[PDB]
RNA sequence: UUUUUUUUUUUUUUUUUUUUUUUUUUUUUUUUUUUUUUUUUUUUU
């Protein structure tokens, strides 16, 4: 309808509305530009010194990020790990058959000049070093993310990990909520280390030091929720990835989907850079984020909730998506899966059940399709005047009533308002 | 009916009522007049000094706006940012062709003479300067707007931002509510800076200092709510902008609409001056305001509420609009969209579903004409199903502030 | 006794402001107050 007129007086009006941008950036379409990920670990002073500046700065309640980065690089240059097979991503050849490589085999540059305390702090601290101190430093990255009292839930475990080798304790005193170390995550160089470590131990899963993954793990797939919700959807319906896809039933979800499955981005790859696209700063607007995939995110989570997901009762309810239609589509999917059990004899002793029996005996009209086929159901749905039948509605009610403790703006609370009146 | 007579005695009466004015002012119809936006950053004394007068005045509990403006101009003349493509708005050619430009490439004049403390304050403060001090100053603009305890919600984040570089803390002590800095927003020169900064970093989205956008952002589209509600309406119904338009069903909403879509105002433009029409003082009565688009604003928000918007349960309920009719029209729109799911197979494996296969059964899709007609058939009075639809949309809403269209909606439909 | 709205008037008549506002919306990115890994009956000589 490129053209709209106003009837009263036959004048043209040209409906337009403010431009929005934030185009996503994929990982591949970046190793076009550079062919290395720069890690500006700056000053290169003694490790013995650095071990000091931190062990102090920590107990103190302030310590330069610049210092901790430098210390980490220091205690982590263990060139451990022997390449099982080969290894390469996005063209970059990280190593190969049994080469020996270490964490920072992901691209080190140095820089700047200014620091803090002079040359050499308090010698008091020894090689109660690598062992555990780095783990702490990395641990805090995880803790620095959660905005809620749950943080002290993690820190608890964050140290009841820790105790392993020396049995120390707390270091700061100040809660968090953003101010303390909670802002380390804002240091492009810090994150790059966290990512490099996680990506590294994800490969050498078995390694005395692979315990460092604690707290370094919440960097893997950071800002890739949509991919995850898609994964859960499959697991939770029993359907294949291609079958689940066909059940997508509104454009902007298909749009979203197409956007996520763009090829040659290595998402199905074992150990690639793609999962850390954010923390290595490969991309500044993830294509797989839940906020750039709102329609999908809603549909997928609402559906899983109707199918009894626990995860899904607390997902966030995006804004500016087409709710009513998104949820009608979810209901249907949920209803189809919900009433047609896979159900098929699996083992036997000489006597199977052949499902056959002259498969026609009950309702032939408004009895809904047998299996889980989009076409059968779409058609059945047409037959129903494209308006949810009372049973579906009943299905939804019995899935959302008896949910309790629902945070507002979650799709849990949305679902319960919509269906359990 | 230019003529009204009184039956009892055949005398003419001439109904008239008080004149109202506030005609709107568009942005374009202004770069007719001037061709520059004047920024009277006054005194031009040392930055080192200024850094002082504020760092003091702040911790104190009073500091001249005049000073802070000057300080800002001081720490912000970073001529950073290299023009990606070209850049021009309303005729004004801001930059070009790989040019390098900085924030204040939007028109500086100087003025007046009088100030406050003498020449040089407390040297105590250094270049813990640009880094973070300006951000604070700008941050306050945002905080200075909200009239509610939510302000300390923003200031919280307003500093837990802050904490990056230096880790400082509070500066005033006195809450807010209009008195402290909450009045900086009244300084035509202050705002002009806020706008210039926002408009600048909206262009150079990627820039070490682009973090300054915090708190400078609520100036973008300030007093342009109607435009926003129209955008949400589209997003929330799934309809195109031209299709949504056709669902407008009462004159004064069409009037309103026509007013908003006046051409050559650059509203669909990426980075124009239009969004900052108020803070650059391009216009003193926005055409896009919610108060100059009441009917639209009501209709648009009511409809979105029926369609499950969360945003919309708290919109304000304008006065002096035609409620009953405005809401009948909204209901219908909401009912149409609400019952006809887009619903269409999108991916396949060799076997698509071809959709191919009464009286008071309502139209199939979402077409105004089909529905208008169906509605005629219904004696232009909402059927029991619609009414039911409305109820199930508004009951189970809780926590409604009064004068919101949330509360209006719940009173009308969930008896 | 004579009185009688616990009425008053003087003007009034939104415990409305119009100057601009109107999601007690938002840096951005983002969103199970998920997860180290192993487990996961606050089962047991």
From Swiss-Prot, chain A:
GO cellular component terms, A-Z: helical viral capsid; host cell cytoplasm; ribonucleoprotein complex; viral nucleocapsid
Binding site for RNA: 142, 151, 205, 213, 285, 316, 407
Annotated stretches, region: Interaction with the phosphoprotein: 349-389
Any one GO biological process: viral transcription
Xref: SUPFAM superfamilies: Rhabdovirus nucleoprotein-like (SSF140809)
Family affiliation: Belongs to the vesiculovirus nucleocapsid protein family.
Role summary: Encapsidates the genome in a ratio of one N per nine ribonucleotides, protecting it from nucleases. The encapsidated genomic RNA is termed the NC and serves as template for transcription and replication. The nucleocapsid is bullet-shaped with the tip containing 8 turns of a conical spiral before reaching the helical cylindrical trunk. Nucleocapsid assembly is concomitant with replication, therefore viral replication depends on the intracellular concentration of free N, termed N(0). All replicative products are resistant to nucleases.
Assembly with partners or alone: Homomultimerizes to form the nucleocapsid. Binds to viral genomic RNA; this interaction contributes to the virion assembly. N in the nucleocapsid interacts (via C-terminus) with the P protein (via C-terminus); this interaction allows to package the L polymerase in the virion and positions the polymerase on the template, since P acts as a bridge between N and L. N(0) interacts with the P protein; this interaction prevents the uncontrolled aggregation of N(0). Interacts with the matrix protein (inner layer); this interaction contributes to the virion assembly. Interacts with the L polymerase.
Protein known as: Nucleoprotein
Organism: Vesicular stomatitis Indiana virus (strain San Juan) (VSIV)
